[PDB]
Each structure stands twice: as structure tokens, then as C-alpha cells.
Amino acid sequence: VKQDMPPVGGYGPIDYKRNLPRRGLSGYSMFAVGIGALLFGYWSMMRWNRERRRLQIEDFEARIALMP
Amino acid sequence: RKTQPYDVYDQVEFDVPIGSRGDCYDRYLCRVEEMRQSIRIISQCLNKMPPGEI
């Protein structure tokens, strides 16, 4: 009786392919995402700055009326 | 190994990577793909093992 180490009836395969998914996102659409977030920021920033200008006009009125 | 097979390398399917531009990044890819070819040679070596003697 002999007790070497052969494979047990043979062995399964091992792949050797380069798994790279190239994800992705269709980068023109990523420009759409970036410009969309950019313009969102511009619109909200615009609204908030103009209302802070309103309240700063109230502070101008404070120094005007208080002064004499 | 391929031109003068000094051992049983002649009886496995593998294919050595070559370069084109003759270049260090290209040489880097050549080394990594020789590693992946060595994965190939180990797989075929395990499946082709004769149980002779030491």
C-alpha cells in the first residue's frame, strides 16, 4: 500500500482574468450631477443672501433712527 | 524556458507577456502578468502530477 500525495482524482480550475468593472457612471452624467449640485447651491445661496440684505437694511434703519 | 526547455516546462500551456514600447510602466505590467502566468502554471502542474519517486 502506498500513501503519496497525488491530487484526489484531479483538481478544479483557478481563473486568471483581470476583473476590473470600469464603473463608471457614464461620466457625462457625472457632469450632470456636479452641475446640478452646483446650481442648487447657487439658487439657495442667492435666496439667503438677499434676505440677509433685507435684515441688514433693518440694521441700517436702526443706526439711522437711533442716532440724534 | 520556451526556446530551450530545460525541464518539463514544454508541456504546459502558458504564454509569456511581451512589451511594446520598451518602458518601465510596460515592464511593470510585464512582471504582473508573468505572476498571473505563474498562477496558470501552478494550476496545470497540480492537475498533471505523476506519482513516481523522489
PDB file of C-alpha atoms in Angstrom:
ATOM      1  CA  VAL A   1       0.000   0.000   0.000  1.00  0.00           C
ATOM      2  CA  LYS A   2       1.253   3.464  -0.956  1.00  0.00           C
ATOM      3  CA  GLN A   3       0.407   6.831   0.567  1.00  0.00           C
ATOM      4  CA  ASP A   4       1.937   9.572  -1.575  1.00  0.00           C
ATOM      5  CA  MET A   5       0.176  12.883  -2.171  1.00  0.00           C
ATOM      6  CA  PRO A   6      -1.438  12.989  -5.590  1.00  0.00           C
ATOM      7  CA  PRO A   7      -4.496  15.124  -6.263  1.00  0.00           C
ATOM      8  CA  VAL A   8      -7.683  13.354  -5.270  1.00  0.00           C
ATOM      9  CA  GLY A   9      -8.985  12.474  -8.721  1.00  0.00           C
ATOM     10  CA  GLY A  10      -7.862  15.863 -10.040  1.00  0.00           C
ATOM     11  CA  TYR A  11      -8.359  19.477  -9.050  1.00  0.00           C
ATOM     12  CA  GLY A  12     -10.745  22.247 -10.014  1.00  0.00           C
ATOM     13  CA  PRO A  13      -9.613  25.271 -12.002  1.00  0.00           C
ATOM     14  CA  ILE A  14      -8.415  28.668 -10.858  1.00  0.00           C
ATOM     15  CA  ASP A  15      -9.120  31.615 -13.126  1.00  0.00           C
ATOM     16  CA  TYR A  16      -6.550  34.229 -14.048  1.00  0.00           C
ATOM     17  CA  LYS A  17      -8.594  37.017 -15.646  1.00  0.00           C
ATOM     18  CA  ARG A  18      -8.275  40.717 -14.823  1.00  0.00           C
ATOM     19  CA  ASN A  19     -11.515  41.636 -13.006  1.00  0.00           C
ATOM     20  CA  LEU A  20     -11.885  45.395 -13.480  1.00  0.00           C
ATOM     21  CA  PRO A  21     -15.501  46.568 -13.755  1.00  0.00           C
ATOM     22  CA  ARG A  22     -14.782  50.041 -15.268  1.00  0.00           C
ATOM     23  CA  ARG A  23     -17.528  51.547 -13.094  1.00  0.00           C
ATOM     24  CA  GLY A  24     -18.220  54.007 -14.351  1.00  0.00           C
ATOM     25  CA  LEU A  25     -21.435  56.038 -14.056  1.00  0.00           C
ATOM     26  CA  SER A  26     -21.249  57.413 -17.676  1.00  0.00           C
ATOM     27  CA  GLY A  27     -19.230  60.485 -16.723  1.00  0.00           C
ATOM     28  CA  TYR A  28     -21.231  62.936 -18.802  1.00  0.00           C
ATOM     29  CA  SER A  29     -23.950  62.089 -16.289  1.00  0.00           C
ATOM     30  CA  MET A  30     -21.445  62.806 -13.541  1.00  0.00           C
ATOM     31  CA  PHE A  31     -21.027  66.283 -15.020  1.00  0.00           C
ATOM     32  CA  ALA A  32     -24.818  66.494 -14.903  1.00  0.00           C
ATOM     33  CA  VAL A  33     -24.687  65.550 -11.203  1.00  0.00           C
ATOM     34  CA  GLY A  34     -21.956  68.064 -10.404  1.00  0.00           C
ATOM     35  CA  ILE A  35     -23.501  70.983 -12.282  1.00  0.00           C
ATOM     36  CA  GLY A  36     -26.866  70.104 -10.721  1.00  0.00           C
ATOM     37  CA  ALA A  37     -25.476  70.279  -7.188  1.00  0.00           C
ATOM     38  CA  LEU A  38     -23.542  73.435  -8.087  1.00  0.00           C
ATOM     39  CA  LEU A  39     -26.639  75.184  -9.407  1.00  0.00           C
ATOM     40  CA  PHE A  40     -28.695  74.011  -6.412  1.00  0.00           C
ATOM     41  CA  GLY A  41     -26.150  75.722  -4.216  1.00  0.00           C
ATOM     42  CA  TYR A  42     -26.320  78.891  -6.297  1.00  0.00           C
ATOM     43  CA  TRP A  43     -30.094  79.194  -6.115  1.00  0.00           C
ATOM     44  CA  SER A  44     -30.312  78.580  -2.364  1.00  0.00           C
ATOM     45  CA  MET A  45     -27.330  80.832  -1.668  1.00  0.00           C
ATOM     46  CA  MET A  46     -28.951  83.552  -3.778  1.00  0.00           C
ATOM     47  CA  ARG A  47     -32.195  83.444  -1.807  1.00  0.00           C
ATOM     48  CA  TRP A  48     -30.443  83.503   1.556  1.00  0.00           C
ATOM     49  CA  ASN A  49     -28.123  86.379   0.689  1.00  0.00           C
ATOM     50  CA  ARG A  50     -30.959  88.585  -0.482  1.00  0.00           C
ATOM     51  CA  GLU A  51     -32.956  88.030   2.699  1.00  0.00           C
ATOM     52  CA  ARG A  52     -29.884  88.809   4.780  1.00  0.00           C
ATOM     53  CA  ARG A  53     -29.596  92.025   2.781  1.00  0.00           C
ATOM     54  CA  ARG A  54     -33.166  92.824   3.857  1.00  0.00           C
ATOM     55  CA  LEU A  55     -32.358  92.379   7.513  1.00  0.00           C
ATOM     56  CA  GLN A  56     -29.124  94.349   7.178  1.00  0.00           C
ATOM     57  CA  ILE A  57     -31.264  97.164   5.757  1.00  0.00           C
ATOM     58  CA  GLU A  58     -33.179  96.958   9.019  1.00  0.00           C
ATOM     59  CA  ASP A  59     -29.904  97.414  10.898  1.00  0.00           C
ATOM     60  CA  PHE A  60     -29.150 100.479   8.773  1.00  0.00           C
ATOM     61  CA  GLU A  61     -32.543 101.819   9.834  1.00  0.00           C
ATOM     62  CA  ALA A  62     -31.568 101.122  13.434  1.00  0.00           C
ATOM     63  CA  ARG A  63     -28.482 103.315  13.262  1.00  0.00           C
ATOM     64  CA  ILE A  64     -30.398 105.956  11.292  1.00  0.00           C
ATOM     65  CA  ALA A  65     -33.302 106.293  13.687  1.00  0.00           C
ATOM     66  CA  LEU A  66     -31.341 105.894  16.889  1.00  0.00           C
ATOM     67  CA  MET A  67     -28.647 108.447  16.184  1.00  0.00           C
ATOM     68  CA  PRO A  68     -29.763 112.010  17.190  1.00  0.00           C
TER      69      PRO A  68
ATOM     70  CA  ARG B   1      12.157  28.423 -20.693  1.00  0.00           C
ATOM     71  CA  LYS B   2      10.357  28.409 -24.002  1.00  0.00           C
ATOM     72  CA  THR B   3      13.194  28.238 -26.506  1.00  0.00           C
ATOM     73  CA  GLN B   4      15.337  25.680 -24.643  1.00  0.00           C
ATOM     74  CA  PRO B   5      13.000  23.830 -22.268  1.00  0.00           C
ATOM     75  CA  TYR B   6      15.433  22.562 -19.689  1.00  0.00           C
ATOM     76  CA  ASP B   7      12.686  20.595 -17.890  1.00  0.00           C
ATOM     77  CA  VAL B   8       9.007  19.733 -18.287  1.00  0.00           C
ATOM     78  CA  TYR B   9       8.022  23.393 -18.907  1.00  0.00           C
ATOM     79  CA  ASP B  10       7.443  22.362 -22.533  1.00  0.00           C
ATOM     80  CA  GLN B  11       4.220  20.531 -21.560  1.00  0.00           C
ATOM     81  CA  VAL B  12       2.098  23.275 -20.012  1.00  0.00           C
ATOM     82  CA  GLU B  13       0.029  25.944 -21.718  1.00  0.00           C
ATOM     83  CA  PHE B  14       1.402  29.332 -20.780  1.00  0.00           C
ATOM     84  CA  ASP B  15       2.248  32.446 -22.754  1.00  0.00           C
ATOM     85  CA  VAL B  16       4.915  34.954 -21.736  1.00  0.00           C
ATOM     86  CA  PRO B  17       3.934  38.637 -21.864  1.00  0.00           C
ATOM     87  CA  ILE B  18       5.936  40.867 -24.164  1.00  0.00           C
ATOM     88  CA  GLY B  19       6.410  44.578 -24.083  1.00  0.00           C
ATOM     89  CA  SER B  20       5.822  47.011 -26.887  1.00  0.00           C
ATOM     90  CA  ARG B  21       7.160  50.487 -26.115  1.00  0.00           C
ATOM     91  CA  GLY B  22      10.119  49.226 -24.093  1.00  0.00           C
ATOM     92  CA  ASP B  23       9.243  51.090 -20.988  1.00  0.00           C
ATOM     93  CA  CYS B  24       9.166  50.930 -17.217  1.00  0.00           C
ATOM     94  CA  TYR B  25       5.420  51.019 -16.744  1.00  0.00           C
ATOM     95  CA  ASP B  26       5.254  48.498 -19.542  1.00  0.00           C
ATOM     96  CA  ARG B  27       7.863  46.458 -17.690  1.00  0.00           C
ATOM     97  CA  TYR B  28       5.694  46.660 -14.581  1.00  0.00           C
ATOM     98  CA  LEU B  29       2.745  45.184 -16.450  1.00  0.00           C
ATOM     99  CA  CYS B  30       5.082  42.524 -17.821  1.00  0.00           C
ATOM    100  CA  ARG B  31       6.057  41.462 -14.298  1.00  0.00           C
ATOM    101  CA  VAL B  32       2.470  41.332 -13.037  1.00  0.00           C
ATOM    102  CA  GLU B  33       1.366  39.255 -15.970  1.00  0.00           C
ATOM    103  CA  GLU B  34       4.282  36.868 -15.508  1.00  0.00           C
ATOM    104  CA  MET B  35       2.915  36.377 -11.995  1.00  0.00           C
ATOM    105  CA  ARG B  36      -0.516  35.627 -13.401  1.00  0.00           C
ATOM    106  CA  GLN B  37       1.046  33.193 -15.865  1.00  0.00           C
ATOM    107  CA  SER B  38       2.683  31.552 -12.874  1.00  0.00           C
ATOM    108  CA  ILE B  39      -0.807  31.045 -11.429  1.00  0.00           C
ATOM    109  CA  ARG B  40      -1.616  29.236 -14.695  1.00  0.00           C
ATOM    110  CA  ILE B  41       1.442  27.020 -14.478  1.00  0.00           C
ATOM    111  CA  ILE B  42       0.680  26.041 -10.874  1.00  0.00           C
ATOM    112  CA  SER B  43      -2.886  25.052 -11.826  1.00  0.00           C
ATOM    113  CA  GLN B  44      -1.802  22.846 -14.715  1.00  0.00           C
ATOM    114  CA  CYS B  45       1.073  21.441 -12.621  1.00  0.00           C
ATOM    115  CA  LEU B  46      -1.300  20.323  -9.885  1.00  0.00           C
ATOM    116  CA  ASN B  47      -3.562  18.702 -12.420  1.00  0.00           C
ATOM    117  CA  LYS B  48      -0.682  16.917 -14.180  1.00  0.00           C
ATOM    118  CA  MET B  49       1.199  15.300 -11.307  1.00  0.00           C
ATOM    119  CA  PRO B  50       2.803  11.850 -11.720  1.00  0.00           C
ATOM    120  CA  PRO B  51       3.371   9.819  -8.542  1.00  0.00           C
ATOM    121  CA  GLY B  52       6.791   8.393  -9.285  1.00  0.00           C
ATOM    122  CA  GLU B  53       9.535   8.736  -6.636  1.00  0.00           C
ATOM    123  CA  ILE B  54      11.639  11.444  -5.020  1.00  0.00           C
TER     124      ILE B  54
END
